[PDB]
Amino acid sequence: IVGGYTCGANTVPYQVSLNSGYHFCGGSLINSQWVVSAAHCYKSGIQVRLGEDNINVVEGNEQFISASKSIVHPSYNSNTLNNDIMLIKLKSAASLNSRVASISLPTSCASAGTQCLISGWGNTKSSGTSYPDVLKCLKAPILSDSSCKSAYPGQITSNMFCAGYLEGGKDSCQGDSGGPVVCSGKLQGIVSWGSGCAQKNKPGVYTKVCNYVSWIKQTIASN
């Protein structure tokens, strides 16, 4: 997250870190057994880390649970990033508590102008590289479809939206991938892609979760 703020320990209780020897992507806990992330974050041998603040220090609220299964969306295209969504099942159920909690799925799509919270452990500089240990947060609005399309001609599908600031300065970045965009208490986006971070006229692009709710529910119901 570029241009954000330190969230505070365990104030984003659905935020998880995906770890394969090291943090590599965010995700969002959606029930005691299942995490939402980006398909471009797929790999084997994922450990899900819940209850994290400083991802380099054991601080006492973590739960580390290995993935039993990953499911990439059936229509994911890695070239265009269309349908950039996967589900990860945990080998055992998380203990839910005030610091480790699921985030509700949307019941309708959010509109442009809606305020959202974006979070992660990704890069905090727009030029240069600096990775934070503790979780960073950014309040940002969803942008209109038309300004998203004009920012990225030929690249925005009906399964993507833009959020952030056309002026630049405040955006998600590398390492935030797969993490949440939550608006009015619902998971409306997943950190997906952008051309650099925090550049003018290049806002972040997010997977449009409300398009996927019936696939998420029926996948969970049979797996």
Ligand SMILES: NCc1cccc(-n2cccn2)c1
């Ligand atoms: N600024 C949005 C964004 C989201 C996710 C990843 C990136 N990124 C990948 C390489 C560099 N930045 C950017």
Ligand SMILES: [Ca+2]
């Ligand atoms: Ca920790």
Ligand SMILES: [Cl-]
């Ligand atoms: Cl792309």
